[PDB]
Every structure is written in C-alpha cells, then in structure tokens.
Design a protein around this ligand. Structure first.
Ligand SMILES: Nc1ncnc2c1ncn2[C@@H]1O[C@@H]2COP(=O)(O)O[C@H]3[C@@H](O)[C@H](n4cnc5c(N)ncnc54)O[C@@H]3COP(=O)(O)O[C@H]2[C@H]1O
Ligand SMILES: [Mg+2]
Length: 90
RNA sequence: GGUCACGCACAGAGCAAACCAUUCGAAAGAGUGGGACGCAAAGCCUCCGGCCUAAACCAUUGCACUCCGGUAGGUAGCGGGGUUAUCGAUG
C-alpha cells in the first residue's frame, strides 16, 4: 500500500496554483524532503494534490500525522497514491 | 483607372515590442503618455483552431504526470479566415 507519493483531496478549490504549492510545501517539510508537489486545477484534478517524498517513510509520517488536518478551512483527506509517480518510476 | 493574385523592388506615408510612468482590471491583460524590437496589413473584426487568465455563477469529493469542464475574459504583435487600404519589379 505505501508509496513515495501521497494523494490529497478535500482541498479548497478556490486556491491558486502558486499559493497551494507554497502552502503544502511549508506543511509537509516536517516529514522529509519533497522532490516536487503536483498541483493542477483541471476539471478532474481540482481540490487534490500529489506530494512526492524522498523516502516512503516520509510519506507514512505525513499521512499518519496530518489526516483530517484543517488546512484552509477544510480537514485534509490523505491517502497513499495507488500508483508510483512518473519521477519514481524512473 | 478599376479589378483577381502576389512581395525580390521603387515612391511615399504609417504602426510600435521590450522597458518605464500612469490609469482600468481579481487576473490575463487593455487605455493613455514616453519609447523603438520589429511589421506588407503589426488597419480592423473572436467566425475556425490554439495560448493565456479564471474574480463571480454553474457543475465537480475527482489517482494526475503533454495539456484539457460550462461560462466569462483576454491575445488580431500565435496561426486560419473575413473585411478595407499605399506602391507596382511581378502572374
Ligand atoms: N504590400 C506592399 N505594398 C508596397 N510595398 C510592399 C508591399 N509588400 C512588400 N513591399 C515592398 O517590399 C519590401 C520588403 O517587404 P517585406 O514584407 O519583406 O518587409 C517590409 C515589411 O515587413 C515592413 N513594413 C514596412 N512598412 C510596412 C507597413 N506599412 N505595413 C507592414 N509592414 C511594413 O518593413 C519591411 C521593409 O519595408 P519597405 O517598405 O522599406 O520595403 C518593402 C516594400 O517596399
Ligand atoms: Mg520607404
């Protein structure tokens, strides 16, 4: 089940691309190094993000401590990405 | 002269990117001034593609990695197309 990348939905959709990333970056650094934060505001990708960590444990630490963490008036829903991000698959 | 098409010229004339001041806008970006990178339509119009922005309304609780909802805007100096225009070495 666990993977380097964590899936995050129930995010506020009204947030910009620049802001959203900067805000997630500031939050999840507590758990390890983030290689890149994948945020797009396309129809299917609104209110969700992907955070890719250095080690898998970093994602686990993040996932277990931030579940339902009220971020921008909304408690986050965090789960592991079911498929490895294209950066890791390389 | 009128006209179909075209740009290797020749005669004029014109337009003005960047950057800056300044206003309008949530933004993309536009107006007005100063500026000239360049433009044969860099006059004009969003009808066809694309790109950009997304404040509001609407839809959306969605596993993406090329981007990509409806609608709203922008860009004609991204292309197509429509339209009007200076010169004729040109077909
Ligand atoms: N439709 C036309 N009517 C009359 N003459 C034409 C023409 N198309 C081309 N030419 C002639 O050929 C020259 C080169 O044209 P080009 O388009 O390659 O290169 C041109 C063009 O790209 C640009 N340019 C100049 N004036 C322009 C304008 N009024 N509108 C658009 N672009 C212009 O600067 C270049 C040099 O200008 P320049 O007049 O000295 O030189 C031009 C012009 O004399
Ligand atoms: Mg001349």
């Amino acid at each position: 089940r666990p993977n380097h990348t964590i899936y995050i939905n129930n995010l506020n959709e009204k947030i910009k691309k620049d802001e959203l990333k900067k805000s997630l970056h500031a939050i999840f650094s507590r758990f390890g190094q983030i290689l890149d934060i994948l945020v797009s505001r396309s129809l299917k990708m609104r209110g969700q993000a992907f955070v890719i960590f250095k080690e898998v444990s970093s994602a686990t630490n993040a996932l277990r401590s931030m579940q339902g963490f009220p971020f921008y008036d909304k408690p986050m829903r965090i789960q592991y990405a079911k498929t490895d991000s294209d950066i890791i698959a390389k």
